[PDB]
């Protein structure tokens, strides 16, 4: 039997449980502190500038309507449609047949 170890050296970190828990705690407490400061600065802006200087920041969104097209075939300019057919074709076909 072969015991492969693909752990990536994680076995050498002591008390991994509490060390992952620690790291997660520092990311969480840094995210919550910077939220609780951004929400204070927002409130202070809203009290100093009221609802009229913070109303200019609200843009008008356009919402799409359905514009159901009949999907007619696009006609190219005459130079473009003249290039695909052989130059001999003009006046060759009986356009009633």
């Amino acid at each position: 039997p072969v015991m492969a170890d693909l752990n990536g050296g994680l076995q050498f970190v002591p008390e991994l449980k509490e060390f992952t828990a620690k790291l997660r705690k520092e990311l969480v407490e840094t995210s919550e502190v910077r939220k609780a400061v951004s929400i204070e600065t927002a409130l202070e802006h809203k009290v100093v500038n009221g609802n009229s200087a913070d109303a200019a920041y609200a843009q008008v969104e356009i919402q799409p309507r359905a514009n159901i097209q009949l999907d007619f075939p696009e006609l190219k300019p005459y130079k473009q449609v003249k290039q695909i057919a052989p130059a001999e074709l003009e006046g060759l076909l009986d356009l009633e047949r």
Partner: protein, 48 residues
Amino acid sequence: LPMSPNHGTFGGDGMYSESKLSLETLFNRWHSESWANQLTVCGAIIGW
């Protein structure tokens, strides 16, 4: 076999660590028991 280095380290995972660890018997069994010719056991301790 999908092995783990976690053996009740993290915990709070019902019986995962029990299931993972109990596949380590298959190393010794491959010698003691008579199925060597039909199955080879390659544990793979799978990391983060």
